[PDB]
Amino acid sequence: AWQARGLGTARLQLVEFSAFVEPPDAVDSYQRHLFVHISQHPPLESVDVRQIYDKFPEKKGGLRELYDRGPPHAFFLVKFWADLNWGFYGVSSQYESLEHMTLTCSSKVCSFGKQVVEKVETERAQLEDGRFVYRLLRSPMCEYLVNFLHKLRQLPERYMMNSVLENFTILQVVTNRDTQELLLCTAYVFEVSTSERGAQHHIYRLVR
């Protein structure tokens, strides 16, 4: 009954995340394709964290050791169906909270469980309508993922894409920079959506 209904905690909720591409045409007439997209403008299903330990690093900065530090209720699994049917490649995250903090946002890209690239932004808060807003908008997508996307896109069969994406994950950890306590940890596993449907997501709580 205290279990989350969306991707967030009482201390920090995710408002919106999107990874996208804007073609060069967008200047003449703006358009943008969304690979994956969560919008959050009944309890959530659950998943046993151990079942995914192997899909992420297993030493310092790994899922097993992060979950043991807790708090447990901060851990979610996002299952994406990516829309690979479609420039500037970018990503945008927006969070909210009732407390003024300075967040440190780490995004680990992982292949066969081994960290491959990592990014660590830092977002100070901006109070707006009584609640603090954290905006990491239009951040450039990392060069590894943009290449991955163009390579992934050319595989002749969708089941080959999903074969590759079985071994590709991303891990995000948002922590209070000043106190080191963790606020929200999201694990992302990927599938490619069929050509006819657009991106969708299924969010789960990570339990033990």
Ligand SMILES: CNC(=O)Cc1cccc(CNC(=O)c2cc(/C=C/[C@H]3CC[C@H](C(F)(F)F)CC3)c(OC)cn2)c1
């Ligand atoms: C600044 N340039 C650098 O090189 C430094 C750097 C390193 C790592 C990550 C970033 C930016 N962060 C994302 O790019 C990012 C990307 C994603 C997801 C990207 C796509 C990748 C393709 C897949 C698909 F192939 F499955 F379609 C769909 C998701 C994400 O997700 C939480 C979270 N973050 C930047």
